Curated annotation (Swiss-Prot):
It is linked to Lung cancer: A common malignancy affecting tissues of the lung. The most common form of lung cancer is non-small cell lung cancer (NSCLC) that can be divided into 3 major histologic subtypes: squamous cell carcinoma, adenocarcinoma, and large cell lung cancer. NSCLC is often diagnosed at an advanced stage and has a poor prognosis. Neonatal nephrocutaneous inflammatory syndrome: An autosomal recessive disorder characterized by intrauterine growth retardation, premature birth, fragile skin, recurrent skin infections and sepsis, failure to thrive, nephrocalcinosis, and nephromegaly with tubular dysfunction. Some patients have chronic diarrhea, and necrotizing enterocolitis. The active site is at 142 (proton acceptor). Residues 17-284 form the Protein kinase domain. Changing residue 166 to Q: Found in a lung cancer sample; constitutively activated kinase with higher levels of basal autophosphorylation; more sensitive to gefitinib than wild-type. Changing residue 9 to A: Abolishes phosphorylation. One of its GO terms (biological process) is positive regulation of transcription by RNA polymerase II. This is Epidermal growth factor receptor. Changing residue 24 to S: Found in a lung cancer sample; somatic mutation; strongly increased kinase activity; constitutively activated kinase with higher levels of basal autophosphorylation; more sensitive to gefitinib than wild-type.
Amino acid sequence: GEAPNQALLRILKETEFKKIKVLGSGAFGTVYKGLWIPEGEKVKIPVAIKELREATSPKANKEILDEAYVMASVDNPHVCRLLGICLTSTVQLIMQLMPFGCLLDYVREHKDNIGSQYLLNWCVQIAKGMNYLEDRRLVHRDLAARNVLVKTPQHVKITDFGLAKLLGAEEKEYHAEGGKVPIKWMALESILHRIYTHQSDVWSYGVTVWELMTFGSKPYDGIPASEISSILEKGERLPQPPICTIDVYMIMVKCWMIDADSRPKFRELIIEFSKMARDPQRYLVIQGDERDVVDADEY
């Protein structure tokens, strides 16, 4: 009793796209840069390519196709879309590559030029995007400043659905079974019970905001992951960013509550920030404030 998906999954030939440089690598495989040159069309399109490690792992080969499915079905202005998929022996994913890298790497550069009206807008956008996902019953499981592409300083998008997971008509949570996870970004509940919910993503959002407000600082710096859980159970959290009014930090604090039902909801996170974004100066203290080829969107 739902709507038909109709999302298009385009298949690409290993010859339609080249790899320029590697961007990251892990137990999954590797993510290269390179550009795509559609069949026939005389236009180069910079994209990101995620290739696997081995084409013999029924587990990874299944998850990879899952990630494809979800990134191919999402249709939001603040969520990256999959461009195509290459069913080569080691399945490759071809997605959008924002011309400004990730929001994390952005703020660590323009930190001395980043105003408030901007930071608050990014908060709005990310939330808008996540809320969209909540509607699709999706759980990013991997929100972080590192996983937020920058299409333009006035427009950012979410990506990386490696860990992402879909929910069952009745299912309200998802239980995971082992596999590397970013501890310093996940809810206490996802550590003590490996449980992941929409409210768990809210937690990650918090942490993500902190990064932005800190201009890319590293959370729980040094403090190794093999204790966070204990730190958290001790009521300890990330400190209040100097530039942040109690008004803002509070939203963050509410994000990192033990009771998942006491944390804010992406629906309301959008209103809350939206409000603030109208009077940024009254929420952020950032002295000096007032001071061949295509894009990827060409159906």
